[PDB]
């Protein structure tokens, strides 16, 4: 008709649609696009009245505990219906931390955390995990995952070291294959730095957190990274360029500083480097209250937080709560000439560019036929393959002349499974699982190590579980062997920062009691290397299983010799925390186990 609106026409080029919509928008509509809010503060009126551009779920932000995929779809669609009811009908994009599967969601497949994936040296595996993750995210109606974390963790004292594929940038680079898994492969023609998402069965990705988040002093989370530009560019930056080449749709800025300059206020790096040198054309998003934390104390000059961040080049702000204040302050700054319209128009161009590119104007609503992708057995099979491939065998015999303990026989009259982490699904998933910090016990659908043992063994094999047996119990039990699992409790972000890296008790005391009685395979669950000499000294065999996720049969696949051990350390294992930071090229490089170490077995 003469009711045609070019931006609404799916046959037009993305840039023509962006320009056409931009040209129609009020300042309020523009600033609304730049605002991302928590679902916890969203209502239909809020979304409509403030022209909100995006919503998220922070860790543990769920419609309710145990919600079905359809409950999530219906929640997301309710918010979208409100956004579509605005004058311009701009759909919101909904983001979430799907960082090892769609991990906030009950019944979602939970993949190994990134450090384990590093150990696989299998970028195609990681791609396929991207692919599966996209499907389980879209099962829930969600279009945007805040992944991959391409931090290069340089000090394992950092509470997010498990979110880093490796201390070696080349491994992190190789695992940027998660991006085309989540988003789809970019076409032959593609210009590096353009955003890309294939369509409604894929999700927008997010390379995070730009830049040097894994380089902070003593691994303190959100702190300062002191390194010259050459080291920044040589360690922390390279994977951002691989992300551009694969069309990552968004980049999230780090809470960390670089030589004292807050990333969230760093115009030279965000605009000068990311946008102007790497030619990034997607949208730059803040971290959660990232702009607030520009100042000390945080939140003490919000006016300045908004100015500094938007002038630095950020496009979308993860507020995520005080949207009225954010919108009011940015409006005032624009009205006062402090922030030019050209900056607003750039941020909104980028946001709209991602939304049009990914098909969000053509498919703003969830597909109910996708709900059944959640926790699909094919995806669990993949997680089980990844878990097994992630495992790094550190010891398999106390002496060079002992019979190797692994692989264990599936037939034996009686076996012991022991330890705090042998039958605890939450602990084997770690942080960013159901809750932000993760949790203990049977928090979702999966298979614990105990469950996996019982599923694996010959029917004549009696399996005895004892969480923390004493030495006499073990000696008296008539056991052929034991599998004993211990390690770190779940943690996320600052809560995981840890200067001593010794596992909690009872962990070591149980290993000692078990292994003193019967030959034992110790399965160490951790997000990083931890003090391990005492555990090694006690154990016949020891496996670094990292945080292998929901599919504990990946552990038993290698214990019982269905597959051989192939994992190799993607990080240095230190002798002592007083050595840290210590990386695979220093000077005082005196590792317990060097990067790349890993014993192997053959399938039986
Ligand atoms: C769940 O947010 C936490 C933040 S951290 C922040 O969260 C965003 C969104 O979940 C992630 O994508 C990002 O990788 C991460 O750095 C803490 O710093 C907050 O203090 C906490 C308070 O509720 O929430
Ligand atoms: C502080 C100390 O002496 N030992 C601790 C442990 O109890 C603590 O929970 C952890 C977290 O940082 O670090 C180690
Ligand atoms: C680093 O942490 C110290 C100690 O908590 C804190 O006082 C300082 O502000 C932090 N620095 C940065 C840049 O975040
Ligand atoms: C495993 O296979 C390799 C190569 O074929 C061989 O050299 C090694 O001795 C094998 N180990 C065992 C226990 O069979």
Author numbering: -1 to 602
Please share text taken word for word from the publication where this structure appeared.
HvExoI catalyses the hydrolytic removal of nonreducing glucose (Glc) moiety from a broad spectrum of poly- and oligomeric β-d-glucosides. The crucial role of substrate binding in HvExoI implies a pair of the aromatic Trp286 and Trp434 residues that form a clamp at the +1 subsite, which is positioned next to a pocket-shaped site at the −1 subsite, housing the Asp285 and Glu491 catalysts.
Of the tested mutants, W434H was the only mutant that exhibited broad substrate specificity similar to WT, contrary to W286F and W286Y, and W434F, W434Y, W286F/W434F, and W286F/W434A that lacked activities of at least with one carbohydrate substrate. The G2SG-OMe thio-analogue bound weakly to native and WT recombinant HvExoI with the respective Ki of 2 ×10−3 M and 4 ×10−3 M, reflecting its ability to attach at the +1 and +2 subsites instead of the −1 and +1 subsites, which was most likely due to the rigidity of this thio-ligand. These data pointed out that the replacements of Trp434 with Ala, His, or Phe residues in the +1 subsite, disturbed the optimal binding of thio-analogues, due to the removal or weakening stacking interactions crucial for the correct positioning of inhibitors in the active site. While Glc remained highly restrained in the −1 subsite in WT and W434H, it was mobile in W434A, hinting that the overall flexibility of the catalytic site was little affected in W434H, but strongly affected in W434A.
